[PDB]
UniProtKB/TrEMBL annotation, chain D:
Ca(2+) binds at residue 37. It comes from Thermus thermophilus (strain ATCC 27634 / DSM 579 / HB8). This is V-type ATP synthase, subunit (VAPC-THERM).
Length: 41, 128, 578, 40, 470, 385, 312
């Protein structure tokens, strides 16, 4: 059981890491294109 | 024991709907026969004035080729370039100043806009 | 004073247009329909406003105005026995006005301007008066609702209003500089009320349950956490605490609660609850109710509104208990607001600043000296509901690092008809050592030692369960049989308590102390007898048991006599035992 | 069995005829009214 | 009517128009294209520079010259009437059965006004759903939000159809005596297919339940925004009926998962940052606004009870949608794949199924007084029987005591008859009697959760009707 | 356009025992077959195209390896149609789109295939569509969105992907043409999720639309046990409505036998949890009987040899007879164990050689072998007494 | 790398078992590099120059220290040259790719610099198409005696199969050969585990008239027995060794002997007949009735051989 908990929490942490990575990427690209379209006005 | 009342109710509703659509067809008949009667100029003038007042700065007053006599003077004094068009029966078409907007004002437009509001009083006068 | 129009309705609850003089975090009436909004981002002439209700139906060109004030709550007489929403609006008057539905764009005053109150001045013209000093006296449901100078007001009295009887808008006292002190005032929600000094938790807050008041005490101004499992009857415990504690004032707050909350939060409190003295409990009660489908801003600000009211009543000169109904829904509302503000998540989608908000809320409670020199205390009992019963979620982490006591509920405990279903194993309290001296000087010198002895007995009984279940109880040894029997007797006759009974509902400190003394005396006699040679079965049928276990339903006056006679009966039992 | 459905029909046509004939005598005023509001 | 031309941008489901100051937020517009076809769209943004239009249809005929934009309504409303009973609508308010449009008594906003908390009251009366396991262990109560948890292949639609065409109340059981309460069902379909549509038509037509039924049907291929609008329309109709004509409305939502998917895609279409698990951060409040507009009030006789149906995405309960549903609702009825595989209908799993207000829905005046104790005893006995059944697979029935074999037999009979009620319709009395007969298999005295009086009153009857009669 | 939609009431043949028995698909139905690489999707699609019952088969290779297409092209002209006997190529129409072909052609190929399928349906035929991959379609959509600079949805897929998939799948059905003629289209969709992830968005959007679902697993593929259908994770929703057709066409009690087979499999799967913690020796004999019967069913009825020239195509009647004899044998084994007879002697009974070797018997000779099996099975238990 | 070098050295068709063609001209090896290390490069150069084949093998070296972007062009140039050779002069060409991980590195870097829409772990979303532009440039053409065979080498980072690169490659290619760390630690070369391995064109390379007809049955029986042995190992991990029956120990012996002999070969070169005789000897261990997948005649005319008769 403790090994199962260890594997579960490790995988959960990895998936949370990927989620945070892709959401930061999306916000960054949205901000970049917003700024560029605004300066192109 | 129950399908009977369902079929009775649906027959009643479809009969009422048929009567209502007949009323609508009669209304359309009454509307499309107006121009022969000499009350046509008054209708076209009302539509023109309401279209122009709802569209500030209108540059043009589109109309029918056969509707020049009743609206030409008003269009000229308003300071717009009016032109003819075989379309827009029973109404006039205002044009915005920028040319990107317009208001079309045929009677059928008002009729099928306000038919849904009509339905209540039509029902309660037909059967109330 | 600042007026503008609407430029860009970019979606739900988003506005922007030139509002040059607007300042940060001001409540704004928006549109011709007068929707309430808050300014969160100033840029150039324009500024952004977030609306509480959905912005459906609006269009550009609608005028926008600012109230020049942040979020604030009106504090004055007439707030007791009332019901308010998340943003301090009267629900009953709204019901009478706009019907069963809460229509958007309705305006209501928190304090009714019609009811007149008997004014009683306390100063004469020419006297110096500072913020926090007492000024007037008004009765409200049995006790005086005093009148306080606003915290940031200082001056000399020009003239006072005569005794008379007046409405809330009537300005009673005018300072020499010309300002007019109305019967009430307002305080911004996100600024703690100023205090002279903060004191220490050197006195206990008497809840009324033996298990709580003994094993996990909470001092005057501490914080407590309880889980929210279904079937444990948290309503019963909450009601018992509200009506049996030593707190002068009880404030109930519920944010983001399930749909069927009125079932127990709006029917029993008005009627089913009666204080130890008087008629209805409602006359000394204030509620902030906010169901799920209310706009998120209320679900987020209700906690601050409640704690602000609590601080007001603490500076008033009373003792107030504040019960947050649920913080999981509050964190849910915080996460929704974050998703509205597009701040990147930290863990499980929660904003990084969650712990800061929890600390800034939970630190407001305590026992302090008011600005008027009086003593008061705000004590908070916060409830947290884990998403699946797991404490590992971040909100429980941030809560357990700031609470002084964390009681444990469980549906299984009540599944075996044991009430109150307060787990006595995982719970902890950090008020014990500081409360030890007062316990010694007011209950018994050995009282902490008795508590430690009962804790040791509980630990021993817990450490022997598996050898019982695996093998069978009756097949064990006489010492172990004795310890199991005494642990069972304790856990079924001292920890347990009925709530609905007239007698058992409330229990003083010394009643529990004497009960523990009798139980431990019987335990000592039993140990002596079994070591001597007398078996467990005779002990099981000694005449002392059916009387000592029956002590729960005796009144306070008779307890000294019943206690001394039961001690003598224990003495006589050993004479039969040896 | 089926006589119940038989008079189900019979009164269904009865109701349909009743509503149609009741309405047919109330058409002119409705047409005039509708034409009145629709024309400004 | 005003026409806005000047299309400047076309991409996917969004297009821009200029000088549209007279278009309020959320207003619905039509699109007249070169071919003359009239499309639909909702304005999702407005500004002095221009306005944004989202189009819930295909865009394979547009251009920048011949396309025109005009308004049809300030706010998406719905025309309602009482005579709508028996009709079927396509989710945007269009009848589809083939009868002329109804006459609206009054037009209402789809997004209703939230209910004042002081108006509500404690629910007290149940509903005889017709399914014995539901009617005994998870007794539905008026004004309750009781969801049903489905599986990948489990037949939720058939269960919904049976509940809809078997539901009724029991005034005679209470002190009411005679029947006087009008009753109706509002049925919502979101993201359904041809097979489901045809099956629902047949089920609601053959048995004659349509005449008291209202249907809102939306195909899967149909646009997403219509799927968004449909549940709000259903709830609006239900609220109006209940609070203006004293009806009791039993609302059914066939899918919340398709609704959530459509909401997520629509939110992403506006370039909005997603939150936890990629779903919108506000999905909790939207689910609440759909669910929470149901209950009982004071001074009125109406009552809205709601049974949303959702399928767990991968049989999991930690998914955000069922987690939020558990936050909002008052329990759940968990279907089990095992019983469906084994051949039992309907595959309802009593072990994890749970209700919350059921404690106040059973008892004398509301039901018979033996409801709660019998339910608890049955639950515990079934748990024991299942455990001992798994134990016998290694030990063996020879090496077990009497009560273990009696539990094994009782559990087998329980899962063979009490849960396998099939297409038949039962009453509360028959379910209670069958439960009594099944408990009669167990030796007396074991029923620790049952008082002596009821044991003396009812114990002894055995299974007689179920095997001899349908 | 179509005149009317008709409820599906006739099964669509596949030629595979497990597919055409446990998880049937109606004439106008849809069935998704996702899985990881190496599960043998190419063989499955090829066999389904070869041995179907529809008149015209439309093959759509949406972004797949060209070698399989070349094998099909050079192989079909050497196979007689099971229905007419002509070269199978005449009834088969192929749409070719290799992986290295330009990206923007995959969606066009898919739409061309579905449109041609609808056309041949309108002509009054039976049409079976093989969309060899939808993950390639989704990848092309994502690639377009990449340089379109939109705000992508979950996992970088465009938001309208679910709507596109729904529109693609919904075109199938059994309808009456504008000329008043009956026809149908069958869609066999395949998904290649990244790394065998059945939880990916596209597959989940599929599970909420299609009425039949099939699954493949790596462990069975390693054992080479084709078709390698993970029975636990696969389900069908067309089973109920097909009962009267089965009764009138194959056997009156066939559905009951199928449900008994499913019950046996379910009990075996339930016992597997205890098996994987205690071992088979500690169990009772009557439960070892269940385990071994499940093994026999797995390795003698579900398994099919995709290359054997006699067992490649199987009729429904043959599988029905196999199931009948299997269940009869199991019931007799239960009755014998009821008489204190152990299981070890049962596993040594020689009739199991016939049971295993049965499936290789030709189509027409099968009834005689089935009669011999019935009498031998009855004797093997009755003679021992 | 050693496996690739050995395969290149020993590869040759067997027309004697088919009868068509009698030239047996050795293959032309094409070496393409993507960030190779110096040690591996020296190994490959020494092997190819020892084999006596460098006179007919084109090497496209691209070291690690070389500029990163140049990795994007070496595979394409190598494939173009190989295709030109094979389809202009019918040379039988075998192509060796040094590393695809560096190709993915360069592609991901150039894509991220352009800020495209990434994939699962930041890889470009058109990586599938990019790899299809490479791998599908292989095979044979109707009416020509040329041949193009690709033997790419890629490294799973965390010994992982769900990684985007191996997953996409397996989707694109017809089967693969996977190695195993546990076998490598136990001193076995080559550490090829037959379970995860697969070749989709197996059925077209066997049968009567090509090698021998009993190939398929032998292979499938070996897979079945090995899978049984693995499951029995897993069961023994808990239940121990005492409760094992006779046939379970038989399967365990078959599995461990199989791993020790059939897989472990120590750089020696075997013909198809030697391997088939070894396989028959291994199968002789199991009871003759357990070979349910094998036809009776093959068992009759091939079974019974004992292991020590192959070597002592």
């Amino acid at each position: 059981i403790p090994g199962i908990r260890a594997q579960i929490r490790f995988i959960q942490q990895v998936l949370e890491q990927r989620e945070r990575e892709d959401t930061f990427r999306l916000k960054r690209i949205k901000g970049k294109i917003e700024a560029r379209e605004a300066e192109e006005e | 024991e129950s399908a009977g009342e369902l079929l009775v109710a649906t027959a009643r509703t479809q009969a009422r709907g048929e009567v209502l659509e007949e009323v609508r067809r009669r209304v359309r008949e009454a509307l499309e026969a107006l121009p022969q009667k000499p009350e046509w100029p008054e209708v076209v003038r009302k539509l023109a004035l309401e279209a122009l007042e709802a569209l500030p700065g209108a540059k043009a007053l589109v109309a029918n080729p056969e509707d020049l006599p009743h609206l030409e003077a008003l269009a000229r004094e308003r300071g717009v370039e009016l032109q003819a068009e075989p379309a827009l029966r029973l109404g006039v078409r205002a044009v915005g100043a920028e040319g990107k907007t317009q208001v079309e004002n045929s009677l059928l437009a008002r009729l099928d806009r306000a038919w849904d509001a009509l339905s209540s009083k039509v029902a309660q006068a037909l059967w109330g | 004073m600042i007026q503008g129009v609407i430029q860009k309705i970019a979606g739900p609850a988003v506005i922007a247009k030139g509002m040059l003089g607007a300042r940060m975090y001001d409540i704004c009436k928006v549109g011709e329909e007068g929707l309430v909004g808050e300014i969160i981002r100033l840029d150039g002439d324009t500024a952004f406003v977030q609306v509480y209700e959905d912005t459906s139906g609006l269009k550009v060109g609608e005028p926008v105005v600012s109230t020049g004030l942040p979020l604030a709550v009106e504090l004055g007489p007439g707030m007791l026995n009332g019901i308010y929403d998340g943003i301090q609006r009267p629900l009953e008057r709204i019901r009478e006005k706009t019907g069963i539905y809460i229509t958007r764009g309705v305006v209501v005053h928190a304090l009714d301007r019609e009811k007149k109150w008997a004014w009683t001045p306390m100063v004469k013209p020419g006297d110096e008066v500072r913020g926090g000093m007492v000024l007037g006296t008004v009765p409200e449901f049995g006790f005086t609702h005093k009148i306080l100078v606003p915290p940031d007001v200082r001056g000399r009295v020009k003239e006072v209003k005569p005794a008379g009887e007046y409405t809330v808008e009537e300005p009673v006292v005018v300072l020499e500089d010309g300002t007019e002190l109305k019967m009430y005032h307002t305080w911004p929600v996100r600024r703690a009320r100023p205090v002279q000094r903060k004191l220490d938790p050197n006195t206990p807050f008497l809840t009324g349950m033996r298990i709580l008041d003994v094993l996990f005490p909470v001092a005057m101004g501490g914080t407590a956490a309880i889980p929210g499992p279904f079937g444990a009857g948290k309503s019963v415990t909450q009601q018992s605490l509200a009506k049996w504690s030593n707190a002068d004032v009880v404030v109930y707050v519920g944010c983001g609660e399930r749909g069927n909350e009125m079932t127990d939060v709006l029917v029993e409190f008005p009627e089913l609850t009666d204080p130890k003295t008087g008629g209805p409990l409602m006359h000394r009660t204030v509620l902030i109710a906010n169901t799920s489908n209310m706009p998120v801003a209320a679900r987020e600000a209700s906690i601050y509104v409640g704690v602000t009211i609590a601080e007001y009543f603490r500076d008033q000169g009373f003792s107030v208990a504040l019960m947050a109904d649920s913080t999981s829904r509050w964190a849910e509302a915080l996460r929704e607001i974050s998703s509205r503000l597009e701040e990147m998540p930290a863990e499980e989608g929660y904003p990084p600043y969650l712990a800061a908000r929890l600390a800034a809320f939970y630190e407001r409670a305590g026992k302090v000296i008011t600005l008027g020199g009086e003593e008061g205390a705000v004590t908070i009992v916060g409830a947290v509901s884990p998403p699946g019963g797991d404490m590992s979620e971040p909100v429980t982490q941030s809560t357990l690092r700031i609470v002084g006591a964390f009681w444990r509920l469980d549906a299984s405990l009540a599944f075996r008809r044991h009430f109150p279903a307060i787990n006595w194993n995982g719970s902890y309290s950090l008020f014990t050592s500081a409360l030890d001296p007062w316990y010694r000087e007011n209950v018994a010198e050995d009282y902490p030692e008795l508590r430690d002895a009962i804790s040791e007995l509980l630990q021993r009984e817990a450490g022997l369960q598996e050898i019982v279940q695996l093998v069978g109880p009756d097949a064990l040894q006489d010492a172990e049989r004795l310890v199991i029997e005494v642990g069972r007797i304790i856990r079924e006759d001292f920890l347990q308590q009925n709530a609905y009974h007239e007698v058992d509902a409330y229990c003083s400190m010394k009643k529990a102390y004497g009960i523990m003394k009798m139980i431990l005396a019987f335990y000592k006699e039993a140990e002596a007898a079994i070591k001597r040679g007398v078996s467990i079965d005779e002990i099981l049928q000694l005449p002392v048991l059916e009387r000592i276990g029956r002590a729960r339903y005796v009144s306070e006056e008779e307890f000294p006599a019943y206690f001394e006679e039961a001690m003598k009966e224990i003495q006589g039992a050993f004479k039969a035992l040896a | 069995t089926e006589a119940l459905l038989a008079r189900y029909r019979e009164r269904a046509e009865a109701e349909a005829k009743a509503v149609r004939e009741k309405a047919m005598a109330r058409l002119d005023e409705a047409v005039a009214l509708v034409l009145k509001e629709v024309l400004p | 009517k005003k026409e806005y031309t000047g299309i400047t941008y076309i991409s996917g489901p969004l297009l821009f128009v200029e000088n549209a100051k007279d278009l309020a937020y959320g207003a619905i517009v039509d699109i007249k294209d070169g071919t003359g076809r009239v499309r639909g769209g909702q304005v999702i943004e407005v500004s002095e520079e221009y306005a944004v239009i989202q189009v819930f249809e295909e865009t394979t005929g547009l251009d920048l010259a011949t396309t025109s934009v005009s308004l049809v309504e300030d706010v998406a409303r719905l025309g309602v009437s009482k005579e709508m009973l028996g009709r079927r609508f396509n989710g945007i308010g269009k009848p589809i059965d083939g009868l002329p449009p109804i006459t609206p008594e009054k037009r209402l906003p789809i997004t209703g006004l939230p209910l004042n908390p002081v108006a509500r009251r404690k629910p007290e009366q149940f509903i005889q759903t017709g399914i014995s396991t539901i009617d005994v262990m998870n007794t539905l109560v008026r004004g309750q939000k009781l969801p049903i948890f489905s599986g990948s292949g489990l037949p939720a639609n058939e269960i919904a159809a049976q509940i809809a065409r078997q539901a009724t109340v029991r005034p005679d059981l209470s002190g009411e005596g005679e029947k006087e309460e009008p009753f109706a069902v509002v049925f919502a379909a979101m993201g359904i297919t041809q097979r489901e549509l045809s099956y629902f038509i047949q089920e609601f037509e053959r048995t004659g339940a349509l005449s008291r039924s209202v249907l809102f049907l939306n195909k899967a291929d149909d646009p997403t925004i219509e799927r968004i609008l449909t549940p709000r329309m259903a709830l609006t109709v239900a609220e109006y009926l209940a609070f203006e004509h004293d009806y009791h409305v039993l609302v059914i939502l066939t899918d919340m998962t398709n609704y959530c998917e459509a909401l997520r895609e629509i939110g992403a279409a506006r370039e909005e940052i997603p939150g936890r698990r990629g779903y919108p951060g506000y999905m909790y409040t939207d689910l609440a606004t759909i669910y929470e507009r149901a209950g009982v009030v004071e001074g009125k006789k109406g009552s809205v009870t709601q049974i949303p149906i959702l399928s767990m995405p991968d049989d999991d309960r930690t998914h955000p949608i069922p987690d939020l549903t558990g936050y909002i609702t008052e329990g759940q009825i968990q279907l089990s794949r095992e019983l469906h595989r084994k051949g039992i209908y309907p595959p309802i799993d009593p072990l994890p199924s749970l209700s919350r207000l059921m404690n106040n829905g059973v008892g004398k005046g509301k039901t018979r007084e033996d409801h709660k104790q019998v339910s608890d005893q049955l639950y515990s006995a079934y748990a024991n029987g299942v455990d001992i059944r798994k134990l016998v697979a290694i030990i063996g029935e020879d090496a077990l005591t009497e009560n273990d074999r009696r539990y094994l037999q009782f559990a087998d009979a329980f899962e063979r008859f009490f849960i396998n009620q099939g297409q038949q319709n039962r009453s509360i009395e028959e379910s209670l009697q069958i439960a009594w007969a099944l408990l009669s298999m167990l030796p007396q005295g074991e029923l620790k959760r049952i008082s002596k009086d009821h044991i003396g009153k009812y114990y002894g009857q055995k299974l007689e009707e179920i095997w001899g009669a349908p």
